[PDB]
Write a protein that binds this ligand. Structure first.
Ligand code: 5MT
Length: 823
């Protein structure tokens, strides 16, 4: 009975049933509350399509992938057992229309199927074969049994004019001179509604006050999701913070005694918002407070002015609203309501500390015919789920829009939707439930949901309880088959993690350890490494037996395991191993975010028939400074190409490294073409994200020319890497204009203005990136970089003049920054 809950725990990596670190029942309330959305989505999903999870897209096929087809014909090799016939098919042919031309077509080597009522041009696997120029090897197979996916069954607030007040009894710490004072903030979003300090006392390991801080706000004017934020300052400096939701999950005003264990500091940072209290009771500072059945209820213009308003609606998400701007938006409430783009600013004009105002806000929300009718803008939808909005109804209108996204687009934004849960005031939310049901409706979304949630639970004390509850809610309806898969995957990576860590210690980069490594690996082949497991970063591929011959450790400072496995699938029509790098040392939650932004940029370019052959490899964080990376085959760093032929830099090297790895001049030109696309993409992307000034041992190239940056987890400068050896391949010497170098420039400018057609989307994604995954780089100035980088305000023409100049700044500096590193 209860051994299943213990199964869920080791799967989750946290004990959801625990109550050692709560001061109310919100987490347990959210467990009981999430049962409905689960049972709905479980009961409504097609068990057969759920079992085969056909990964399909409704987008148009781009112009570049069109001209790779031979007129309404595609070859599709079907396999029986030994023999295999090869059919002509029309892009618009359904999987059924190919079958006649029950059983089901499965892709060879993978747990991936081609089924359902969409044309074969709308399966991603077929767009993957078309992109790389490969042949669609399917295999007539029996459908997988839906039995296998079975699930194991289971006084009014507005009548109170009293000013709100909180008694600060004191703070205690078991171990620490200066003086110290508590600051108590009533908050809503990042907005501070009302502030009150204590008098400064001496900072001993206990400090009492017994003081009532009376706030100017009234109990009736407190809005749901209002945080009492408590902060300890000691010329001042913030040392410890904690929060407490003044209005609870039942809409009740929060009463009584609280001893809250606080978080230390090492600033817009998503950790500063959490309702969680420090679980480390022994080392942590605590504060002691007192609050004293009060429940919350629930319910044309001048020409010049129109222009001023439209000018405000037209500005970027990061452009600050003045009081003048706000008062304008609010007064012309119903004109602002006509423009979906105004909504973020409009709701940033609301005075949330004033009952009557919020009342009118909810009135205005009831008349949102234009919003509901508008075309989904993820950019706009994202802004309403960020840290500037803590109102359920505002945030629910955002989650409304997300409902319309096809599964393929959920996948695109899943990581950042998951991180958006860090900005929710309450454990139960539209957003959490949206993630929950979309995860249970689709095994691919659910797979990655599981890892994304698990990444955070494993290493964020600030949010591991919330995500833990949401994860359990997923696990209790995913199906017995997936529970078994996750259990496998967790077991496998726990083994491999141990091996990785133990081996890191054994050096201060010797090759005598190589045998000690291959020892542990060989001696883990039998117990308890299973004979198959899903690759967590690509749930298509199952991996079976190791290849202990090929497994190595790097001449490095962090000794990552280069591992390779055999594919457990016999129908796999290839000899390629599945490669995985296990690394400790870097925090890969930053690499996940950057890589996901990269895939987002690709799909953007897809809307403008552009392709820049980015290589955003799989990467999954799994624990404290530890995770896996997909191995990109046939690849090497730009530094090693220099260190082999020089040991100290030279221009030529790259080109005859390419040419030597190109078998026929035929292909070699396909490589240098690939290099111009790849190079431009990574220059565009890295300038925008402000991670372009990289040290060439962090940039890689395949044997087919594809360039790609790596290790994103990390004087005079350079906006991106466009070194002479890159230029050499293009065919330009100091100052020239090669046929390819102009094409590079051409692509860069096309791609750069292409990103700018989604400024808002990128701004919001980038802001969220910094706030939820990168604790160090979180200030207005840090965030506003991407405004500058995207040259907000500037016209397309000036923007091209801006980017091309940047290219020149790199040209101007050649090898400087690269060399300057060695010092
Ligand atoms: C730096 C490179 N990174 C990647 N390599 C392949 N695929 C990737 N996705 C990455 C990344 N990121 C790398 N990481 C390694 C970890 C262990 C190991 F034994 C080797 C590793 N390499 C690597 C790969 C090729 C060549 C070299 S080398 C000979 O040191 O220049 C190192």
């Amino acid at each position: 009975s209860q051994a299943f809950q213990r199964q869920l725990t080791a799967l989750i990596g946290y004990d959801v049933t625990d109550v050692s670190n709560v001061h109310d029942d919100e987490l347990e309330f959210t467990r009981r509350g999430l049962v409905t959305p689960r049972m709905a989505e479980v009961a409504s999903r097609d068990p057969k399509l759920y079992a085969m999870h056909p990964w399909v897209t409704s987008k148009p096929l781009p112009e570049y992938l069109w001209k790779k087809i031979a007129n309404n014909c595609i070859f599709i090799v079907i396999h029986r057992s030994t023999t295999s016939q090869t059919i002509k098919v029309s892009p618009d042919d359904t999987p059924g229309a190919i079958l006649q031309s029950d059983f089901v077509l499965r892709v060879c080597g993978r747990d991936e199927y081609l089924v359902g009522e969409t044309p074969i041009k709308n399966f991603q696997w077929v767009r993957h074969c078309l992109k790389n120029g490969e042949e669609i090897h399917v295999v007539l197979d029996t459908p997988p049994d839906p039995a296998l996916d079975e699930v194991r069954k289971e006084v009014s607030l507005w009548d109170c004019d009293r000013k709100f007040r909180v008694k600060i009894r004191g703070i205690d710490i078991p171990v620490l001179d200066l003086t110290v004072f508590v600051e108590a903030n009533i908050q809503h979003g990042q907005q501070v509604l009302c502030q009150r300090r204590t008098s400064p006392k001496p900072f001993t390991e206990e400090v009492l006050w017994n003081v009532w801080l009376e706030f100017s706000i009234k109990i009736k004017d407190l809005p749901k999701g209002a945080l009492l934020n408590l902060q300890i300052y000691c010329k001042v400096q913030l040392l410890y913070y904690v929060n407490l939701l003044l209005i609870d999950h039942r809409f009740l005003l929060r009463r009584g005694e609280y001893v809250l264990h606080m978080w230390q500091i090492s600033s817009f940072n998503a950790d500063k918002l959490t309702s969680a209290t420090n679980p480390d009771k022994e080392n942590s500072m605590s504060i002691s407070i007192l609050l004293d059945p009060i429940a919350l209820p629930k319910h044309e213009m001048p020409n010049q002015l129109r222009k001023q308003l439209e000018a405000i609606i037209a500005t970027d998400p990061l452009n600050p609203l003045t009081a003048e701007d706000k008062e304008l938006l609010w007064h012309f409430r119903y004109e602002s309501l006509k423009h979906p783009k105004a909504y973020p600013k409009l709701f940033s004009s609301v005075k949330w500390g004033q009952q009557e105002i919020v009342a009118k806000t909810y009135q205005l929300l009831a008349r949102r015919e234009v919003w509901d009718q508008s075309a989904l803008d993820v950019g706009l939808t994202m802004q309403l789920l960020d840290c500037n909005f803590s109102d359920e109804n505002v945030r629910a209108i955002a989650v409304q829009k997300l409902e319309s996204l096809e599964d393929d687009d959920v996948l695109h934004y899943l990581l950042q939707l998951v991180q958006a849960v860090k900005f929710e005031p309450y454990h139960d939310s539209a957003l959490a439930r949206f993630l929950l049901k979309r995860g249970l409706r689709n095994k691919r979304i659910g797979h990655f949901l599981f890892w994304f949630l698990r990444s955070e639970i494993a290493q964020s004390r600030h949010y591991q309880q919330r995500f833990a509850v949401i994860l359990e809610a997923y696990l209790r309806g995913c199906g017995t088959a997936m529970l078994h898969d996750f259990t496998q995957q967790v077991q496998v990576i726990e083994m491999l993690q141990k091996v990785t860590l133990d081996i890191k210690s054994l050096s201060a980069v010797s090759s005598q350890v190589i045998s000690q490594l291959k020892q542990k690996l060989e001696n883990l082949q039998n117990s308890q490494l299973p004979e198959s497991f899903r690759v967590p970063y690509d749930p298509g591929l199952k991996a079976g037996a190791l290849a202990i011959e090929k497994c190595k450790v790097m001449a490095s400072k962090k000794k990552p395991l280069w591992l390779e496995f055999k594919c457990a699938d016999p129908t796999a029509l290839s000899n390629e191993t599945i490669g995985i790098i296990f690394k400790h040392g870097d925090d890969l939650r930053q690499d996940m975010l950057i890589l996901q932004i990269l895939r987002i940029m690709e799909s953007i370019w897809e809307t403008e028939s552009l392709d820049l052959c980015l290589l955003p490899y799989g990467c999954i964080s799994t624990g404290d400074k530890i995770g896996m990376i997909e191995i990109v085959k046939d690849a090497t760093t730009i530094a090693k190409i220099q260190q082999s032929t020089v040991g100290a830099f030279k221009d030529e090297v790259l080109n005859h490294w390419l040419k030597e790895k190109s078998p026929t001049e035929e292909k070699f030109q396909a490589a240098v073409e690939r290099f111009v696309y790849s190079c431009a993409g990574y220059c565009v992307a890295t300038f925008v994200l402000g991670i372009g000034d990289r040290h060439n041992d962090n940039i890689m190239i395949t044997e087919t020319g594809n360039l790609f940056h790596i290790d994103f987890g990390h004087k005079e400068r350079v906006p991106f890497v466009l070194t002479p050896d890159f230029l050499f391949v293009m065919g330009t010497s100091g100052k020239k204009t090669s046929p390819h170098f102009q094409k590079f420039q051409d692509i860069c400018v096309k791609a750069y203005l292409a990103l700018r057609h989604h400024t808002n989307l990128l701004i919001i994604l980038f802001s969220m990136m910094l706030m939820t995954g990168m604790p160090q780089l979180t200030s207005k100035e840090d965030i506003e970089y991407i405004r500058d980088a995207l040259t907000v305000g500037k016209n397309e023409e000036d923007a091209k003049k801006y980017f091309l100049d940047q290219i020149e700044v790199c040209r101007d500096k050649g090898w400087t920054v690269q060399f300057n590193w060695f010092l």
